[PDB]
Coordinates of C-alpha atoms in Angstrom, one line a residue:
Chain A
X2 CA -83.6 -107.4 57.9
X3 CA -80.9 -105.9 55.8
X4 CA -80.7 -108.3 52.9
X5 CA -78.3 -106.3 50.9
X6 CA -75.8 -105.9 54.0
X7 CA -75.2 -109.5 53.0
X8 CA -74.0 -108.7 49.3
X9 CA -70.5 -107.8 48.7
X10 CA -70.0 -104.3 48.2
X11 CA -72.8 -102.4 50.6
X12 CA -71.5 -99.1 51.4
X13 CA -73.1 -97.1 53.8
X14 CA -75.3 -94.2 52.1
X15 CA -76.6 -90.8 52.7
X16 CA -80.2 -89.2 52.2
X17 CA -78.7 -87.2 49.6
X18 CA -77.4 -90.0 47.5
X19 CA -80.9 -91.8 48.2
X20 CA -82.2 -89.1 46.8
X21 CA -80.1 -89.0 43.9
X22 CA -80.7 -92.4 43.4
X23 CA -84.3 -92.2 43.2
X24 CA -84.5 -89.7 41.2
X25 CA -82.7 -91.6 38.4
X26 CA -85.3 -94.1 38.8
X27 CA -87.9 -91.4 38.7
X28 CA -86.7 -89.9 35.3
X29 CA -86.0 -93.8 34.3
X30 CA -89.7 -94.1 34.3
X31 CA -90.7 -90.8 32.1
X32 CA -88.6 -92.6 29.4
X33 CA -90.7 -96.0 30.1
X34 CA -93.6 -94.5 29.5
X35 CA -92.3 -92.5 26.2
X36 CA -90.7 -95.9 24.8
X37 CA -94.5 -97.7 25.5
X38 CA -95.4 -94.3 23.3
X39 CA -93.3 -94.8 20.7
X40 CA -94.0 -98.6 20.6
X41 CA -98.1 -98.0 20.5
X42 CA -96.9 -95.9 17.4
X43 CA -94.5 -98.1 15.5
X44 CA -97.5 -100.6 16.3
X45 CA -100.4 -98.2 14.7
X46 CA -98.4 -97.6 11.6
X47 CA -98.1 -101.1 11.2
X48 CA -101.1 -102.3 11.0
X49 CA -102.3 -98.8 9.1
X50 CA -100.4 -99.6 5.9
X51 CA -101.1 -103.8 5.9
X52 CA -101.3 -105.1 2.5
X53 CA -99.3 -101.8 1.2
X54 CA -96.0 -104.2 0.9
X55 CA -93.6 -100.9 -0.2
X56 CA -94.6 -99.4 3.3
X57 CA -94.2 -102.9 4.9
X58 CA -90.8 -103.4 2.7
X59 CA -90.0 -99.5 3.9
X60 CA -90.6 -100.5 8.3
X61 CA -88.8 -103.8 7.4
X62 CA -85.8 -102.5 6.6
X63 CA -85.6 -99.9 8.8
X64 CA -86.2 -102.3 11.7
X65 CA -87.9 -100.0 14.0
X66 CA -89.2 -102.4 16.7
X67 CA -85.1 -103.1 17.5
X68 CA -83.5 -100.0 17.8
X69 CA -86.6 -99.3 20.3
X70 CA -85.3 -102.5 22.3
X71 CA -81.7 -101.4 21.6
X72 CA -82.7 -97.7 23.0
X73 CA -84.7 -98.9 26.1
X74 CA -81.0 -101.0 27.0
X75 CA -78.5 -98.2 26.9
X76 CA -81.4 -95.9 28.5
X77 CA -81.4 -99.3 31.6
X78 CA -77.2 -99.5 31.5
X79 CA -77.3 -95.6 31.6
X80 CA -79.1 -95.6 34.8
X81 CA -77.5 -98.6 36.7
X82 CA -74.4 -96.6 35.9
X83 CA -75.5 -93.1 37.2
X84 CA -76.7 -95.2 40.4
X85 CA -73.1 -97.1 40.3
X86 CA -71.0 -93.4 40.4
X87 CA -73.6 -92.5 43.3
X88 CA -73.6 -95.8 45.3
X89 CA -70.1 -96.5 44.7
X90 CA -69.9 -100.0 45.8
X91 CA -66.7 -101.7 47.4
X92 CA -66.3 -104.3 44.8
X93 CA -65.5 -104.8 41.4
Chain B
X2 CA -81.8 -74.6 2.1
X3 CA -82.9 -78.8 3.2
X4 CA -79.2 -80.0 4.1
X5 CA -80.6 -83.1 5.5
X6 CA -81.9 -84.4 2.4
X7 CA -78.5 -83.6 0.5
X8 CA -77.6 -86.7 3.2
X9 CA -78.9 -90.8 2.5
X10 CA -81.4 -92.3 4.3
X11 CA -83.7 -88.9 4.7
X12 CA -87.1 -89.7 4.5
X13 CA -90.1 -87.3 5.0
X14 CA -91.5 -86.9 8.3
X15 CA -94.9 -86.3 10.4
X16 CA -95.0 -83.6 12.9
X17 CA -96.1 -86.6 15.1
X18 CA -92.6 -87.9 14.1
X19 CA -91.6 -84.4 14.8
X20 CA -92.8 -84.1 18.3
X21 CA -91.5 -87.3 19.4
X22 CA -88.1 -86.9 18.8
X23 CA -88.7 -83.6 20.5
X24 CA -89.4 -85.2 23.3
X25 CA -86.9 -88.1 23.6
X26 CA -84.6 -84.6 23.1
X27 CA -86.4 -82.4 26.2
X28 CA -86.1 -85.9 28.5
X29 CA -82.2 -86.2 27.8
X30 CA -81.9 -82.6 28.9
X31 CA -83.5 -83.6 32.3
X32 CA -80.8 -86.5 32.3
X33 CA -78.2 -83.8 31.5
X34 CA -79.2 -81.7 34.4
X35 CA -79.1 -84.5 36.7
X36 CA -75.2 -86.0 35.7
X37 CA -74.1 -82.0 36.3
X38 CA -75.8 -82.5 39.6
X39 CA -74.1 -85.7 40.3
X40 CA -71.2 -84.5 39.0
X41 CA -70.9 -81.6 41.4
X42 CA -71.8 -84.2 44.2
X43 CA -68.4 -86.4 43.3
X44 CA -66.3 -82.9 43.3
X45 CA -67.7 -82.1 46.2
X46 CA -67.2 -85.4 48.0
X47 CA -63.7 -85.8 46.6
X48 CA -62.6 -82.4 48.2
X49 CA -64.4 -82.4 51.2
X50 CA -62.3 -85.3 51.9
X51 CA -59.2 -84.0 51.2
X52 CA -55.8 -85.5 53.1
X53 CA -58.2 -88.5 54.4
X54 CA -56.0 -91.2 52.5
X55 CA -58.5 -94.0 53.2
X56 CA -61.5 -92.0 51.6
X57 CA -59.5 -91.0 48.9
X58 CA -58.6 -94.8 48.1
X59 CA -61.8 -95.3 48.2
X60 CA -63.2 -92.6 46.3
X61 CA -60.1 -94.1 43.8
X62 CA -61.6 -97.6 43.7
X63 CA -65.2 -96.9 43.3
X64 CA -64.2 -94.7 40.4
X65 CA -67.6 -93.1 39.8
X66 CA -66.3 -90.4 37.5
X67 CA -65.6 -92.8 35.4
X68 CA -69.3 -94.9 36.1
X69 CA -70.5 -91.5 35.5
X70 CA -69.1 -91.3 31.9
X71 CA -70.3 -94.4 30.9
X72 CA -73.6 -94.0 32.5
X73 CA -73.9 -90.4 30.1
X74 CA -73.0 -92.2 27.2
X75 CA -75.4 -95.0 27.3
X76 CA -78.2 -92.5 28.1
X77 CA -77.1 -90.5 24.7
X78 CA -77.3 -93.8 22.8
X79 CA -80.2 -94.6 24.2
X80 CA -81.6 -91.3 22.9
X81 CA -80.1 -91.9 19.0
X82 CA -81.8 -95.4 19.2
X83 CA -85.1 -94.4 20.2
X84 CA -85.0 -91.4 17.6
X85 CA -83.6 -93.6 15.1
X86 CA -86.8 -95.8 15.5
X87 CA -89.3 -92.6 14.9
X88 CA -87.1 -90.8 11.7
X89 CA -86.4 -94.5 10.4
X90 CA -83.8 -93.7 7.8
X91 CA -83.6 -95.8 4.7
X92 CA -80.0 -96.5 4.9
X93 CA -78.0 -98.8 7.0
Chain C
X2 CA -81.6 -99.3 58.6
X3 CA -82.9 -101.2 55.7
X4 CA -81.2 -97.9 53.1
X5 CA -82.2 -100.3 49.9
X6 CA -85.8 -100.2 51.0
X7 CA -85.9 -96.7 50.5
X8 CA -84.6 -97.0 47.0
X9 CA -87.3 -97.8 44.4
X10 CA -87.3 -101.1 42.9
X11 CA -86.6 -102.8 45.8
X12 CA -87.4 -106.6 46.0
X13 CA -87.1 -109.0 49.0
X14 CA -84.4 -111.6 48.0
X15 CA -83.9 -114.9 49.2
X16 CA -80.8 -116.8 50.3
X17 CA -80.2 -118.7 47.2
X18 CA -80.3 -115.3 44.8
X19 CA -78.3 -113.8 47.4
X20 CA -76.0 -116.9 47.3
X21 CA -75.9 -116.4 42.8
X22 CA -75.3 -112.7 43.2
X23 CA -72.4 -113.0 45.9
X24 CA -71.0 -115.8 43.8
X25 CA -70.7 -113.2 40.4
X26 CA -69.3 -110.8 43.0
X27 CA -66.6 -113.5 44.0
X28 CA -65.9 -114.5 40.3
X29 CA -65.9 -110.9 39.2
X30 CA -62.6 -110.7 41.8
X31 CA -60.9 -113.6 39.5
X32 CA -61.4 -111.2 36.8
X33 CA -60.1 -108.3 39.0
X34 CA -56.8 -110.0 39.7
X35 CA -56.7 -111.4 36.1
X36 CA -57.0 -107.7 35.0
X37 CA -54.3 -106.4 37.3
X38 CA -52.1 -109.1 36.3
X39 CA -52.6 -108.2 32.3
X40 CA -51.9 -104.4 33.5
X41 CA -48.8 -105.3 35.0
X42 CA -47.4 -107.2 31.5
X43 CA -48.6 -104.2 29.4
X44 CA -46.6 -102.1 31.5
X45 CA -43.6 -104.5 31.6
X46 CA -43.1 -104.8 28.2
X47 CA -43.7 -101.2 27.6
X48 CA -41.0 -100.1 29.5
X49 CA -38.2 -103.4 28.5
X50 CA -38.6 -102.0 24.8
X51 CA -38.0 -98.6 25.4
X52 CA -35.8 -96.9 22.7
X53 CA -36.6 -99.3 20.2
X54 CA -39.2 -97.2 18.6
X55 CA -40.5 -99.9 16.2
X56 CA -41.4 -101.6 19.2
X57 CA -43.2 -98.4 21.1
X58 CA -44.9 -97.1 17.8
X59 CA -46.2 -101.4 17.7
X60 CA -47.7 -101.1 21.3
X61 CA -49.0 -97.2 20.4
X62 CA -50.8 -98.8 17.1
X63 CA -52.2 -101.9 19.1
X64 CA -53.6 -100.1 21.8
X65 CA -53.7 -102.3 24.3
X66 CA -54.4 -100.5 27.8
X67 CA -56.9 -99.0 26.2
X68 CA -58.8 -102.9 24.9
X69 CA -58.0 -103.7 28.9
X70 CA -60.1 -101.0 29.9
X71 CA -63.1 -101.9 27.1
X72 CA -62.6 -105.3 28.6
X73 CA -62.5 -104.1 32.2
X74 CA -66.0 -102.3 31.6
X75 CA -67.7 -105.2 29.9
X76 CA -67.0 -107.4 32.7
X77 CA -68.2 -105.1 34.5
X78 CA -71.0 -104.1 33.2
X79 CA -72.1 -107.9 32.7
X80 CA -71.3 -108.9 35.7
X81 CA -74.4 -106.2 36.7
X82 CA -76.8 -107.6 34.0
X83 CA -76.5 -111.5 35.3
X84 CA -77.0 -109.3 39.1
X85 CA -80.5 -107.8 37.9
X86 CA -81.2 -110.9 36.5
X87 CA -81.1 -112.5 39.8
X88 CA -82.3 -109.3 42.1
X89 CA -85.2 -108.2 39.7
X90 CA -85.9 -105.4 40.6
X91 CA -89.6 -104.2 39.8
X92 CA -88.5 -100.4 38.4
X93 CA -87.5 -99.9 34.7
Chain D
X2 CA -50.7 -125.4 8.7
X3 CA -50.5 -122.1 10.1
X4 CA -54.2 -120.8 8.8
X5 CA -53.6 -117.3 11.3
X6 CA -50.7 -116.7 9.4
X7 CA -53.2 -115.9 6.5
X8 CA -55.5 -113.2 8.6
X9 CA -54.4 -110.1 8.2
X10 CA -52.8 -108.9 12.0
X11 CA -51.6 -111.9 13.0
X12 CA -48.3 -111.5 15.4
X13 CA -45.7 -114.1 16.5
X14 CA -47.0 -114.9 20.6
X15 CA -45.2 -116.0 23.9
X16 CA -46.1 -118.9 26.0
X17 CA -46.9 -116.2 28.6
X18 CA -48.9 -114.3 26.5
X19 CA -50.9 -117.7 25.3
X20 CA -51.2 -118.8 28.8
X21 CA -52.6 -115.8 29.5
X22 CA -55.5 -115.7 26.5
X23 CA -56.2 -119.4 28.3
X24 CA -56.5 -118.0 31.7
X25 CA -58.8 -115.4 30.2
X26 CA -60.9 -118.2 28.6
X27 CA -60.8 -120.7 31.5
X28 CA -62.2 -118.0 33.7
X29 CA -65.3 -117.4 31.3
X30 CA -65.6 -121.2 31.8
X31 CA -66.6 -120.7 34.9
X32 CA -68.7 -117.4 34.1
X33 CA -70.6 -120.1 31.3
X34 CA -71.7 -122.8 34.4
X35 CA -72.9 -119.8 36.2
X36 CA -75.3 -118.2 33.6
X37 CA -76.2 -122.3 33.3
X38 CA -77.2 -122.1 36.7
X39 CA -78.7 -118.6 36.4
X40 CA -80.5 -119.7 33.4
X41 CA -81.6 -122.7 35.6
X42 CA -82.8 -120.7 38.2
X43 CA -84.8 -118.1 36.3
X44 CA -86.5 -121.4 34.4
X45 CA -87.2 -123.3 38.0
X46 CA -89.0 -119.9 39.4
X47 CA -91.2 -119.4 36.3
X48 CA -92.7 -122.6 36.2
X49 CA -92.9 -122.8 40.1
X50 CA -95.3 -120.1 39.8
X51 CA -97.3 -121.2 37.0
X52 CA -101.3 -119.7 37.6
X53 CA -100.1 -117.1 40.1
X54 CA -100.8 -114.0 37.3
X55 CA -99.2 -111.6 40.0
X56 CA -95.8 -113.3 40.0
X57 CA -95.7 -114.1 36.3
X58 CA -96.7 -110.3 35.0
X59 CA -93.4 -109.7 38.1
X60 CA -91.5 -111.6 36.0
X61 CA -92.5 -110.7 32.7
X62 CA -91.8 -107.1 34.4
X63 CA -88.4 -107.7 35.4
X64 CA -87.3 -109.5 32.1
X65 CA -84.5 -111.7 33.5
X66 CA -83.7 -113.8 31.0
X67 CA -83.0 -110.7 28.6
X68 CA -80.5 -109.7 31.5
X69 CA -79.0 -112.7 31.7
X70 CA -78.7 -112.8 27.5
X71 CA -77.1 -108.9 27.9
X72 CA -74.7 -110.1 30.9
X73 CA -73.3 -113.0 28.6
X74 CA -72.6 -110.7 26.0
X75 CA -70.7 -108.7 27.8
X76 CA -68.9 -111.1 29.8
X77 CA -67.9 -112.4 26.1
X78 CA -67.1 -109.2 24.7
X79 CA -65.3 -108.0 27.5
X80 CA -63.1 -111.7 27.5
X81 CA -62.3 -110.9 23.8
X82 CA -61.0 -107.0 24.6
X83 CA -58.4 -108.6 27.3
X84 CA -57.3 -111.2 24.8
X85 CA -56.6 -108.5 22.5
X86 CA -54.6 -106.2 25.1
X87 CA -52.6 -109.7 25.0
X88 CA -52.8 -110.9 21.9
X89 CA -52.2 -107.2 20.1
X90 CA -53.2 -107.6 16.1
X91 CA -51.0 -105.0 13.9
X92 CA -54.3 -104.2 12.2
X93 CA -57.5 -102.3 12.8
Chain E
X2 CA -89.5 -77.4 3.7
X3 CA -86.1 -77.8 6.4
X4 CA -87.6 -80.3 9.1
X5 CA -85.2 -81.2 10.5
X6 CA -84.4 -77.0 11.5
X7 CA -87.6 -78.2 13.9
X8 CA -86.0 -80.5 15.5
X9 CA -83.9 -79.7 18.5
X10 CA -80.0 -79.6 17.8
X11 CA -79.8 -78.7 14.4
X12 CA -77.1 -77.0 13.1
X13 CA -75.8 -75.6 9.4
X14 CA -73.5 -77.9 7.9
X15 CA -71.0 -77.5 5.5
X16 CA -70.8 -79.7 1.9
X17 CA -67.1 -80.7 3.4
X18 CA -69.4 -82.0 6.4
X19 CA -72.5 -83.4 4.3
X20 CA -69.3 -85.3 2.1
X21 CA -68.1 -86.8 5.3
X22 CA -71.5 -88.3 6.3
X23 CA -72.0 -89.1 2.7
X24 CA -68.8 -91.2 3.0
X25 CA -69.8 -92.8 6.4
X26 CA -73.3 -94.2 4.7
X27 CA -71.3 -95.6 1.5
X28 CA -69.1 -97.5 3.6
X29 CA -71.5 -98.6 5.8
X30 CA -73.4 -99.8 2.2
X31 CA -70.4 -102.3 1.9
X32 CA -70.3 -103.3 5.6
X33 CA -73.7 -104.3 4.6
X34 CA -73.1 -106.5 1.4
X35 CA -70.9 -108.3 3.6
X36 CA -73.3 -109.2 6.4
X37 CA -75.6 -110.3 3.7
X38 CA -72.5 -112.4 2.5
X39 CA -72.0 -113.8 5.7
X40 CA -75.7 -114.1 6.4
X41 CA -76.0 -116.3 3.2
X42 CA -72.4 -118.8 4.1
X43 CA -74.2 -119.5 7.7
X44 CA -77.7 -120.6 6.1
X45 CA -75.5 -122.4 3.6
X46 CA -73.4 -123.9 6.2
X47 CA -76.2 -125.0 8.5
X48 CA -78.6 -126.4 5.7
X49 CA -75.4 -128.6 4.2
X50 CA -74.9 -130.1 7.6
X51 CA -78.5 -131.4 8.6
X52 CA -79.0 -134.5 10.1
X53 CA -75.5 -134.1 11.1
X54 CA -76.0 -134.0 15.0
X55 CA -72.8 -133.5 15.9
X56 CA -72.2 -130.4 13.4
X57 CA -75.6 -128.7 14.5
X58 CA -74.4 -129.3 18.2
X59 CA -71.2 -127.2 17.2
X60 CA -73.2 -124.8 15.0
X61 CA -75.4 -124.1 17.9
X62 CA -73.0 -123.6 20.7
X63 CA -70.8 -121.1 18.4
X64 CA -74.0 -118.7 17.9
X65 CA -72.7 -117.5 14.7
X66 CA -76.0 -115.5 13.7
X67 CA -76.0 -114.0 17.0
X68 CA -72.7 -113.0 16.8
X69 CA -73.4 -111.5 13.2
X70 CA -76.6 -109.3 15.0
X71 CA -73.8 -108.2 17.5
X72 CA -71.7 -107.4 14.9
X73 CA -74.2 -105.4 12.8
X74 CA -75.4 -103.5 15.7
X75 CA -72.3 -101.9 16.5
X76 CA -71.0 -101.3 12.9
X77 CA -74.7 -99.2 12.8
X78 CA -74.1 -97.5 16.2
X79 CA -70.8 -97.0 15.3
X80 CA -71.1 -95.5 11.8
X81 CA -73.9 -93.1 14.1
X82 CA -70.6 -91.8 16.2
X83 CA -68.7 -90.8 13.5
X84 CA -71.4 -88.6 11.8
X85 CA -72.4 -87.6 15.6
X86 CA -68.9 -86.2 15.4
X87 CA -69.2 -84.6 12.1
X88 CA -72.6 -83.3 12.3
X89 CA -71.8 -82.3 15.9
X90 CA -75.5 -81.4 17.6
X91 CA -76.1 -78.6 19.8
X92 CA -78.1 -80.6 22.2
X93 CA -77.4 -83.5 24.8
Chain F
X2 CA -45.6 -123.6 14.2
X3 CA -49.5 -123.3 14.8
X4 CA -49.6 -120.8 18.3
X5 CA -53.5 -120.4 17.6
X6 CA -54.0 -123.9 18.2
X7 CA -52.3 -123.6 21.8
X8 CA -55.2 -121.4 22.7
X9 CA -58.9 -123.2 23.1
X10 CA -61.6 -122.9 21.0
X11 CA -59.4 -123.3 17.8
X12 CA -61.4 -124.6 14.7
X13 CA -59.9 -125.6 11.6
X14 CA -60.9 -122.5 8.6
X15 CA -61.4 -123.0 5.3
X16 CA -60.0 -120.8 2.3
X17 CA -63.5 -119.3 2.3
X18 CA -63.8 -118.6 5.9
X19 CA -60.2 -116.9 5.8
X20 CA -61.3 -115.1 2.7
X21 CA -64.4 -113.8 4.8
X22 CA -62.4 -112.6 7.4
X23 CA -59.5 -110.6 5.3
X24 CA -62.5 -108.8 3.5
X25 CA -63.9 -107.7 7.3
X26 CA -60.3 -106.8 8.0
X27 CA -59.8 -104.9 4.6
X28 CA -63.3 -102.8 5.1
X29 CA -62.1 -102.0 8.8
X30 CA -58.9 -100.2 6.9
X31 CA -61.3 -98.4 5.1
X32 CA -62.7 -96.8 8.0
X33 CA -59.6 -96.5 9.7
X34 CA -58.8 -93.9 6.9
X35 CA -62.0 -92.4 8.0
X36 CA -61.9 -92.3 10.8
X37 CA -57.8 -90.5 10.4
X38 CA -59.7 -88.0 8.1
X39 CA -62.8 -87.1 10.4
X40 CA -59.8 -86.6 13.5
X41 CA -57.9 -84.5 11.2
X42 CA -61.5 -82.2 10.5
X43 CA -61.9 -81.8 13.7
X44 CA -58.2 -81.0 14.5
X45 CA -58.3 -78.3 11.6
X46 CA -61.6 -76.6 12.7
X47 CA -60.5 -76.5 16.3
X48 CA -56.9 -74.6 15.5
X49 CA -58.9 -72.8 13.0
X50 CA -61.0 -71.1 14.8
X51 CA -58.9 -70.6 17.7
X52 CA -59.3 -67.3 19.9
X53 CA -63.3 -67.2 18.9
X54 CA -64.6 -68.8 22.3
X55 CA -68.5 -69.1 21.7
X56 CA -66.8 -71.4 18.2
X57 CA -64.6 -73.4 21.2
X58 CA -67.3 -73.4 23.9
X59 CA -69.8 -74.8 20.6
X60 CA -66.9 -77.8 19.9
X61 CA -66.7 -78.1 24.0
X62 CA -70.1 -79.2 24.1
X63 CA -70.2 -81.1 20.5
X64 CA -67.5 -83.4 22.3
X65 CA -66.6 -84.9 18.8
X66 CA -63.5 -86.5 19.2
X67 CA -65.4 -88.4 22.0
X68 CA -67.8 -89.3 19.7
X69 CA -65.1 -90.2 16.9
X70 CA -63.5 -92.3 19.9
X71 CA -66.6 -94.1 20.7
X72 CA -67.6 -94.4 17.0
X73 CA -64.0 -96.4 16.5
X74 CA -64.6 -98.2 19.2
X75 CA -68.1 -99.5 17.4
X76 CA -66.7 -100.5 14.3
X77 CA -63.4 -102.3 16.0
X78 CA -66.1 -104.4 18.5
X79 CA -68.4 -104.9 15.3
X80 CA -65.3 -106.5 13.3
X81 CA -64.7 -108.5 15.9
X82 CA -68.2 -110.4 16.2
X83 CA -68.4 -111.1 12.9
X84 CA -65.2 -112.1 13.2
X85 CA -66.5 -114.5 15.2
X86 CA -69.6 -115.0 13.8
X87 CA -67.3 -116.7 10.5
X88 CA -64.5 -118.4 12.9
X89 CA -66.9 -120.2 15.3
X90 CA -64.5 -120.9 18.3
X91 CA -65.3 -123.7 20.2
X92 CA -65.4 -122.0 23.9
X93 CA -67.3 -119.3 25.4

């Protein structure tokens, strides 16, 4: 029982910032599911212009794969900190 | 008329290209609607606890105003990222 | 009881991650104090150069409450990331 | 002699201020031995759970080594933002 | 024709604003050279120092090419700020 | 004499290696001019459009001096890591 009463911090919480804190994590998951999207599509337009090297030169350069990974991050640190104002742990 | 491609890096788009960013753009509004929310949550908790010094202090440590700020930024950035990754501009 | 179980994402931890999460909890206090303690400098060499407005326009160019608090959040926000690397919790 | 003399911002330091850009990086020393042991950690329970597809799609899932690589970075980062509230380079 | 008037947040810009972003992108051309620049020195300095263990050993602890993809990722997010600014979208 | 190697992770530069970081340091001027000419924009079409409150409620919600404050931010942290990326201290 009540692992995280063992980490420094806990704070006592409501329902409402349950609540709260669940649905971040349930809006959290319509942008997983539009990130897999736009990954199946970077993916698709790949492989439909191999052997086309401007096109492959063109997706190369504008490094579409990592601003993806770098826009799935700050979507994550967005959340934990949305959950972090709500929580409000006792500890830096 | 076509101010965008007066700017470098415009490149033509699909309507599939279109629709996504569209979307990326109706999903931040959810996000939007849900900081006001806990926004009004941390007004409200901050006055309903008025003249309680110990609440205040620890309303004043938490600091989720501030957790709140970051976490809407990193969500926005989020958002660019992903949209950068469907327009892919040809410029750095 | 058991409030964490009712957030999504919730993973039972053992002893030893609890063990690595309270000890970035315990160093993230060094950094607290270390913080405070940079805070309290800024703000004594602030005011021992008052009127000498070389000086004040020096510390207004260089900024440095405000690199503090970048610094602050980074620690902070790393200090979460090595956390979720240890919790994992199975939501986005 | 004197190659910081040569990079542009450079500013005549105190003891106190150096002891406390040494402070700074004697307490990421100790943040270094703990994403070792982190790091560690993450590499024992992989391979302890070699075969079990469950466990190893939960890991893949929680990605913790990618959160251990974004806490180090901003551990780092935020080290470097206090050392330049101390340090305070006269240029951009 | 204009599709970027079907995406959500346009708005008309001036040629005083379209200058500004113009300006933005032509630095950020020249930030670019240079990380090529730099880019080049590390494969130069790694590839002049093989078999050297002791040099790879300190080549590999600094993370210099990591450092240089930190550094590139936030010239690019921040170049994305200032024309944010400029640009100034009516949308979240 | 020689305050920077009081501090750990001092490494001796060469010419080249100071030459790469002055021309970081001379491009970060660049945008600091920028940057002073995008604040002063946004300070003129504030004033100038004063009394109009659906033009200050449209500025309100553009937040562009926030974005011009995170976008400096960017470019500063991004100097810094390649920076680092051509110093290669020997610490964390």
């Amino acid at each position: 029982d009540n692992q995280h009463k063992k980490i420094k911090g806990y704070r006592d919480l409501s329902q409402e910032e349950i609540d709260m804190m669940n649905r971040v994590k349930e809006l959290g998951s319509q942008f997983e599911k539009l990130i897999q999207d736009v990954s199946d599509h970077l993916r698709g337009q790949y492989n439909a212009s191999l052997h086309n090297r401007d096109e492959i030169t063109r997706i190369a350069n504008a490094e579409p794969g990592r601003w993806l990974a770098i826009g799935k991050t700050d979507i994550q640190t967005g959340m934990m900190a949305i959950i972090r104002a709500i929580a409000q742990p006792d500890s830096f």
